[PDB]
A paper describes a structure:
To gain molecular insights into the post-catalytic state of FN3K, we sought to capture HsFN3K with a phosphorylated substrate in its binding site. We mutated Asp217 to a serine residue to create extra space for the phosphate while maintaining the overall negative charge in the binding pocket. We obtained crystals of the HsFN3K∆_D217S variant in its apo form and performed soaking experiments using a mixture of an enzymatically prepared phosphorylated-DMF and ADP. The overall kinase fold in this structure is almost identical to our previously described HsFN3K∆ structures, but the N-lobe α1-helices are not swapped in this structure, likely due to the different crystallization condition for HsFN3K∆_D217S. Interestingly, in the nucleotide-binding site, a clear density for ATP (unused ATP from the mix containing phosphorylated-DMF) was observed in both protomers in the asymmetric unit with a flipped Trp219 binding its γ-phosphate. The empty substrate binding site indicates that either the phosphorylated-DMF is too unstable to be trapped in the crystal or that the D217S mutation is unable to stabilize the phospho-DMF, which diffuses out of the binding site. Furthermore, a serine would be too far to H-bond with the O3’ of the sugar moiety, explaining why DMF is absent in the substrate binding site in this structure. Notably, in the HsFN3K-D217S structure, the distance between the nitrogen of the flipped W219 side chain and ATP γ-phosphate increases by ~0.5 Å compared to the HsFN3K-ATP structure, due to the slight movement in the γ-phosphate positioning in the absence of the sugar moiety in the substrate binding site. This observation suggests that sugar binding also influences the nucleotide geometry in the binding site, and a true pre-steady state would not be attained in the absence of the substrate sugar in HsFN3K.
Residue numbers in the entry:
A (entry chain A), B (entry chain B): 0 to 290
Write the structure that this text describes.
Amino acid sequence: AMEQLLRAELRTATLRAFGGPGAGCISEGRAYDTDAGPVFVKVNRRTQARQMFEGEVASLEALRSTGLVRVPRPMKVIDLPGGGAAFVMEHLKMKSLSSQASKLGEQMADLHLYNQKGSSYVDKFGFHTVTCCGFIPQVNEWQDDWPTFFARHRLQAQLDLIEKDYADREARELWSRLQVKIPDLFCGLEIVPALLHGSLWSGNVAEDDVGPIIYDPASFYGHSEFELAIALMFGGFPRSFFTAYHRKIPKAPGFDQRLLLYQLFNYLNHWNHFGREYRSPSLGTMRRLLK
Amino acid sequence: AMEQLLRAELRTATLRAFGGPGAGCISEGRAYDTDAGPVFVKVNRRTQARQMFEGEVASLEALRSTGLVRVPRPMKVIDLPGGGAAFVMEHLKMKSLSSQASKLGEQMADLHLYNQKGSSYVDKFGFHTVTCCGFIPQVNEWQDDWPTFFARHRLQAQLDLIEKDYADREARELWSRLQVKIPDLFCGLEIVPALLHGSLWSGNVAEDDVGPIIYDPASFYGHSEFELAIALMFGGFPRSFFTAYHRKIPKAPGFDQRLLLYQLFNYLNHWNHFGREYRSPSLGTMRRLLK
Ligand SMILES: Nc1ncnc2c1ncn2[C@@H]1O[C@H](COP(=O)(O)OP(=O)(O)OP(=O)(O)O)[C@@H](O)[C@H]1O
Ligand SMILES: Nc1ncnc2c1ncn2[C@@H]1O[C@H](COP(=O)(O)OP(=O)(O)OP(=O)(O)O)[C@@H](O)[C@H]1O
C-alpha cells in the first residue's frame, strides 16, 4: 500500500490525498497532507525509476544551491516493492505562469550567468551525474567543447537510438552531411558553460503569490541558448519572459540558426519517445539546416 | 475568450472560478460559479475534441439511466473558435475516495449486473456510439463474441497504432502468438454483456458526504472483469472496494490470467498516449501470458 508506505517513510500520522491527480506524462503525481506539511509524490514503475529520480534530485539541488530560482525541495526517494520508485518533494501551491513571467526571465538569465561569474567555475560542459530527458538517460561526460558535447552526447545519442529503434535511412544520411556543418554555427563566439534547467517548457514552470516556480529539471552545464529551445518550441511562455531574459543576455549572432539546431534535438527526443509523428519535424529541421 | 464564450452559452452574468483546478491530463478543467449554479468545464483544443466529449456525454447518460451510481450531469458541448471544444457539466464537491470505497464496490457490481437482472436486453458487446479512450476513438460495433470484440476493437486497434507509429516488430511477433492463446483464457465461460464505466482508475472516482462519485467514463458493454483491470494496476483503490465487489460477483475461473490480458490493453493505451516508456510493460505482459 502506497499510503501506508508513505506514512512509514515520512513518519507522519496523517496522510490525506488532496486535489486531482497530477498532470504528468512521465509519472503519476498525487498531493498528500502530512503533519509536517503538504507533500507531492511522483510514482514511476519502471525498473530504473530510482536513477531517473536521483538525477532529478541532483538537478533540483544544483538549482537550489544557486539561490536564484524557486524549486520544490526534494525530500525522499523510496524504492517501491514490485519495482520502480516514488519521489517525495515539498508541495507547492502553483498556478500557470503569466504575471511572474518577466521575473522568471530575469531569474533564468541570472541562473545561466551564475557559473561564469561565481567563485568556483565549472569550465566544462556536462554534469557530475546522469540526468534523464524524459525517460531516456543522458550521458553527461564532461567535455571542453560545447559543439562537441552537443553533437556527441545529445544529437548523436538521440540519432543512435533512432537507428536502433527505427533504422531510419533518411536520418542516417542527413546526419552524415549535417554533422560536419555544425562548427559553422559556433565559430567566432565565446561559449561559456551555464547551469541549465534542462527542460524549461511551459509545462515545467508555474507561479504562486511570491513568484515564479520551476520544477522537473534535467540539469547539466551547457549553452544557455539550448535552454530557450524548449521555451520557444512548445509555446506557453508569455513574451515578457523572453523580453526580460534577453535584456540581460542578448541574442548572440547566429541565434536563429543555432535555434534550429537546438529545436532539432527536441524533435529527435520526441521521435524516440512518441514515434513517427516526429519524423517529419526531425528530418525537415535537418534539411533546413543543410539548405 | 473562453470565459466570455461560457457566459454567452450558459446565459449567465456571473462566472467566478473557484478551486483554481487546472485539473486533468487529457483536458483542462476549471470550476465556475454561475447564476444557475456551479459548473465544471473541460477544454480540449484538438480537432476531434467534440467527438471525444460526445462519447463522454453518451457514457455519462448511460450510467445515469441505471440510477445505480452518482455521476455528473452532462450539460453542453461547445465548439471553440480556433478548433477544439468545451464540455460543461454539473459541478460536484468531491474528495478522494476512502471511506466510501466499499460502497463503490457494491455500486459497480450492481452496475455490472444491471444488464443481466434489470429491464436491460443488450445481448451483444459494444456500444451505440463511439467512445474515446483518452484521445483515441474506439470502434464499438456490436459483436456477439466478447473475446472477438476485445481482440479486434481493443487490442488490435491499439497495436495497429503502435505499428504505424513505432513499427515495433517485437510487439508484432508477441501479438501474433498471443492471438492464438486468447480463446483459451476464457475457460469456456459464457460472458454476459455488462455496462462498464470504461476508465475506472482511482483518478476518475471520488466521494462526498452522500457517498462515492465516479466520472470521466468511456462506456461500453463488455466483460465486467475488464473494469477492475485499470483499477488494480494503477492503484488507489482500498482493498474493501474489491472485497465488496467480489462478494456480489465472484472471480470466475481464469480471472488472474484474463486480468493480465485486460491490463495489457491499458499498457498499450498508455504506450500510444505517453510513449515508449510503456513498451517494456506492454511486452512483458504479453510474454507473461505466453509463458
Ligand atoms: N511540488 C509540487 N507541488 C505541487 N504540484 C506539483 C509539484 N510538482 C509537480 N506538481 C504538479 O504535477 C504536474 C506534473 O509534474 P512533473 O512535470 O514533475 O511530472 P512528470 O510526469 O515527471 O513530467 P512531465 O509532465 O513534464 O512529462 C505539474 O504540472 C504540477 O501540476
Ligand atoms: N464534475 C466535476 N466537478 C468537480 N470537479 C470535477 C468534475 N469532473 C472532474 N473534476 C476534477 O477534475 C479532475 C480531472 O477530471 P477528468 O478525469 O474528467 O479529466 P480529463 O482530463 O478528461 O481526464 P484524466 O485526468 O483522467 O486524464 C478530477 O480528478 C477532479 O478533481
